UniProtKB/Swiss-Prot annotation, chains A, B, C, D, E:
Record pathway: Cofactor degradation; nicotinate degradation
Function (record text): Catalyzes the dioxygenolytic ring cleavage of 2,5-dihydroxypyridine between carbons 5 and 6 generating N-formylmaleamate in the aerobic nicotinate degradation pathway.
Record organism: Pseudomonas putida (strain ATCC 47054 / DSM 6125 / CFBP 8728 / NCIMB 11950 / KT2440)
Binding-site residues, Fe cation: 264, 317, 319
Lineage of producing organism: Bacteria, Pseudomonadati, Pseudomonadota, Gammaproteobacteria, Pseudomonadales
InterPro entries per the UniProt record, alphabetical: M29_Exopeptidase
Key words of the record: Aromatic hydrocarbons catabolism, Iron, Metal-binding, Oxidoreductase
EC number: 1.13.11.9
Record's keyword annotation contains Iron: yes
Signal sequence coordinates: none
Protein name per its UniProtKB record: 2,5-dihydroxypyridine 5,6-dioxygenase
Enzyme class: oxidoreductase
GO process annotations (BP): nicotinate catabolic process
């Protein structure tokens, strides 16, 4: 496990990648459920770097109908909703270290528009250490982003039956390489992947969760196939066995035809993340960045897309990584058999 | 002692009086030595009144030459010094509950300029409860403020031989009545007194700390007399037995002529405070507002007066109340033999 | 200092002397200011002795006019006042270990009348170790109780000028030897002393606090004499220096003629208690049993006497032990020059 | 659940069995993630038994590539690696109570070589209570050991297709009956099993994880068979469905030919342990001793064997218990179809 | 006050000066009453410096007849008495940080002989910060040592009547400058003074505690004179008013002629320490090193000399600083009227 001393050094390293120094101000955002060791370590490390530091504690926000303890599960209001003073208290800072899992909101977007950069850190210390950010990871992620911002279409195929096409261009590319160096940037330690959104009402085809593919926030390896039929950017059929029914039942509870929209789409670039990791953790350890980010996955998502000016504001939200896919941007393959093949600069 | 329910209720009471309601944002300012029960009662109470809330934690500021644990003793920089983001974090709020004892500073003056209010609350709960603030305390204190602002001169006599003159006018009256209701106001729960400052280089005569008179932050009842000789606003001679030598040596330590300057002067109007209270407490219990505010005391101060655009910025600061004094504003007496006599409204 | 293991062992010892075993039920009474180590040790110890145990936590009770943190200083309502259910929950136990300092009250007296026995234990572990109860202390105390119950009068002389006479007979003798073995008995770990009360309206003479004598809760060694003139069981004069005036001032604040009545009178039998102990502690640490029980002191008290059916229910309460006294019961001396001389079985 | 009282009494029981008394010294070894309750109980029980005690605290060691929070998952360096002084601090003691799970390493082996004995205690209190050690467990486990030390080979068959042969003799037999009574002896509260290692480069045949069989540290009951093919001490083939792919992925990650080596082999003799227990626990709750020690299991392990001078020093370590097995020493059955049949004195 | 951050940084400074780096082992010694912030800060700082570290926790040891919570007040056995394993646990290390105040004893001396060095650090962080150790301080203190090791006699005179003489030479001089750089060396952060002991049975004359002088551990400033008459290295008479009677009573209580022995003698060389500091603190804040080390004091002690193989191992230990003294080595002044005059290289 990770000692207190190692944990402050890790924060020293990541904050330094994030351009924290004596000119900079750091605000550590926490609530009752924040990991006190991580908060502590972020406060000490920041002070070691000569930054001006303060913590901001907000009362937790609860969505009454939300289930489980993964907060990515229900995308709605946040602790900042209606608390304009606290938001200003965070805008005042250059860098916010977020340990309370503030969700994407117009309130957060307003923080980012002032130049403030935000670094999310909520995984346990041990996950943090295995996926400790590097500049190499930034270069690789950015090489891939260049290639994605020039793409007009995205195609996914798998031997299991995925055949999925997504026109692009209408929306930007997002990257997460694990540190918050550039102003107005949000990032997450740990990460190491990229995505965009399909043009509105256009994503078509079928996506097949094979045996061994994952649905978050359920955090299970599927034991039977689920076939998703998608038309004009919405899931219209969900088929297969017990997982299929559990999925169908879970999406129905939200009682909203918006849950079925396809939101982000992208691939993983983090070789230190492992598909097997999730099997060694409890549900309540964290949100499982290993599943999201592992090298050569295809990650797609359902539900809200308000983050980029999409129509959908629904709380239901799934992230589903697929193994063993072939992924194509226009004519060219970025991933083949779940091995990353292009750009050459993006490869491990 | 004071339970958690009673503490919360007392903070509801004082925050009501400080005009906290649903239109308001409260910031609870704290550091690692803040009492957690007090912080939690303030946060809970503010939410009961439907105000938005957040807590602000700052790292402790240490002045390396300072002695004791009393923070009034050493007036220098503070954790706000060069820490604008932190200051903006407080400025966001309508009302700051200070549980860390931020000392008067240009940075704090800026906060009040914006219209933000500051309530200091750091004494132990039992003390807080005994001097719970009232609208009647404000009335009486504000009645005294009227008289004081007109006054051209202050004069103090005692049978023990105090004979002290101070010319007024050049500097404002300042009140403390225990709550922060007006915009840009600072007050301290608990309090109930007022002071001003004498004209530059002008104060003249002798002050005698009789047997039983008090020096803060030493927190001793004097057992022998201390005679202080004052020329052109400065102490030039300190005479007596052991307390005098103890006092001279304390002042010498600071190695600075600024320490001998007289700062605020004024009288106490808090009948629920008690001169005997100090001898039932330890030093580190707090700063002993009972000695400062007890009804009919004369309280004068030394050292820094940059608070009001004075020349002196030195850390060394004593507050000294005296019993059994007659105090005269111009020709008219406020206190006679330690009893408040004028204004009538201001009496108990 | 005392380790956790040694503290549980000490409690095992005292609870064994208090006749705790597998037939008995023990309730540990605590509130938020209770020493958690002592509570934990009481709970562990009782369970080691196979007793059935539980803890009762009450919300603290504050007297709004009370000053300081010692609770013997203000005798009025308690946490049990108005809380019949909690009282009953205490009544169910055979033995209550009180770690919250429940003052004597009608509710407590009712707990005692059900057979329930109560042991107070609030002093720090180190004082508790030093004055760990023995059977031999009980023997010595009871032998003095035998003598005191036959007494028709008590007389106190001292070279410093004490000359005090009190008829007895009207009221019982109370003993404290530091454990709670008999049903319906209250006792206090640590102690080792006994007292009674003088017949109503009858105590006459002078008691002189010599240099070095103590007033509780002030917890000072007197540096100047205070002379107490007493007539028909009331102090009618208090003369001397600063201590005199401080005492006069303190008693006045209560605005109650009753504070000046003489309540209990007795002597100490605890050689392991030391008159010097007090100047090695802080006011916060405890209520100072060393001062009340030290061998050969004459201890007297002012204020309430509703404990024994007296007229006075006032909150002001002093305990004042005097060194170097001769104490006579009828014509027979029990203490001479602060040394215990009779009964022979009560001596060290 | 288990109280503090009970937990301490369990440590007394176990420490006594482990021959702790007034002649002995106990070091309680710990880190930031140790259960403080277990620590305190070990400390206090050691003092109740009159031993001299201290605790040693090491800062935690993280293997940057390790996953999950079970420390049996990565057997590499430990917090003792290069910390010679800490090693000597543990060598000073007669008995180390290990509450941090010190992996078997050259440093621990050395400690044991000084005569120091070590008792591992890291399972949750309830698990500790369910498998509280007995002298009778020791007898049954020693009776089995006799037969193991007499064997020239070990053979496992099962209806599912296990057909596995292991020449014995090169390496010694090791027992675990739950307490550390003998000098230089390491044991684990709880346990109740025994094992040895096969001769170098010799183990042959196949081992079949049937439905219901367990891989540690994954902590799953397999839903599909996995077949392990073994040649000359090494797994050379892993076949089945999803469990098999996952397993293969996990072993490959470590990128070491060494992970594939068969290490210890043996059977379970703890009837208080239970194959079903694991499905009643979360992954972070413990290491799952139930799964390792249950009566009649066959337990084999992969990876490192430097414990006993074997060539392999790798981190990847699996323990795999198999149900329903026929286990033979030479030609003689010690277990048939998961029931223990010989020796008779080893049986329930 | 001092933040965690700052406190960690101070320990780096101090441990660097104590020559801690990658080659060294640091052991941090503690007990249940050790300040955890200080413990953490020391553990952290030694890691930041690449040292190997562990903590050793000893259960607290309590001398049943000890009074108060200053541990210098009773120098008998310690928590290491009889605990050889723990002593070895500490000898294993190159540098021990003592956060529990191991008293001087045959065990602590033995540790030091193995070449292990020791740094005591128990004063509150704020104090630690005010007298932060410097190389210059060492320079000044070794200069004074030079002088003292040459001296054949020490003589103290004061206007108040001190007239005291002590042959030197039988025993070594000892320095304390704040850091433990040399192997075999004990020091204390904070300090800055030096002392030796007088030849057996030889110190003669009178030492007068004037008004303003201090007795440790009573931690009072004397209000009346106490006169100590000294013959053949023992106090034979103690005279004055109330303080003298108190002191006599305190000494008698231990019932041991060895308490009256004159032990170390010397003077203070620390200008950042202040004679007034003590009056700003509470008894349980620390041991008042300000009072022991202030520049120009003469400090003498009573009770045990066993540390140097002296005859007396009694627990009653007093430390007594006098101001305004002339101190002479042979016939030359090192101090006059409480100001240090030789050697010139020791002056501030
Ligand atoms: Fe998503
Ligand atoms: Fe002031
Ligand atoms: Fe009383
Ligand atoms: Fe294993
Ligand atoms: Fe000493």
């Amino acid at each position: 496990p990770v000692s207190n001393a190692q944990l402050t050094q890790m924060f020293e390293h990541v904050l330094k990648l994030s351009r924290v120094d004596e000119t900079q101000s750091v605000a550590v955002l926490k609530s009752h459920y924040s990991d006190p060791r991580t908060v502590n370590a972020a406060m000490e490390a920041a002070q070691r770097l000569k930054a001006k530091v303060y913590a901001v504690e907000l009362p937790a926000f609860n969505h009454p109908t939300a289930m489980g303890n993964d907060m990515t599960a229900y995308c709605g209001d946040t602790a900042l909703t209606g608390n304009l003073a606290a938001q200003r208290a965070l805008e005042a800072a250059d860098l916010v270290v977020d340990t309370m899992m503030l969700l994407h909101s117009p309130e957060q977007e307003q923080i980012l528009k002032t130049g403030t950069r935000i670094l999310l850190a909520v995984e346990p210390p041990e996950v943090l250490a295995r996926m400790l950010p590097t500049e190499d990871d930034k270069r690789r992620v950015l090489a891939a982003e260049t290639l994605l911002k020039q793409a007009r279409s995205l195609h996914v195929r798998s031997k299991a039956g995925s055949d999925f096409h997504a026109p692009l261009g209408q929306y930007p590319a997002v990257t997460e390489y694990g540190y918050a160096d550039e102003p107005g940037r949000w990032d997450h330690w740990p990460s190491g992947f990229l995505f965009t959104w399909p043009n509105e009402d256009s994503a078509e085809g079928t996506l097949v969760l094979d045996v061994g593919d994952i649905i978050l926030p359920f955090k299970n390896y599927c034991r039977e196939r689920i076939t998703l039929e998608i038309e004009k950017g919405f899931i219209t059929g969900i088929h297969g066995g017990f997982e299929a029914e559990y999925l169908r039942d879970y999406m129905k509870y939200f009682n909203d035809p918006e849950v079925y929209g396809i939101s982000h789409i992208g691939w993983g670039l983090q070789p230190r993340a492992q598909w097997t990791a999730m099997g060694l953790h409890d549900r309540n350890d964290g949100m499982c960045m290993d599943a999201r980010a592992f090298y050569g996955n295809f990650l797609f998502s359902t539900g809200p897309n308000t983050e980029v000016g999409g129509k959908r504001k629904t709380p239901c939200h799934l992230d589903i990584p697929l193994r063993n896919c072939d992924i194509y941007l226009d004519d060219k393959a970025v991933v083949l058999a779940g091995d990353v093949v292009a750009p050459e600069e993006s490869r491990a």
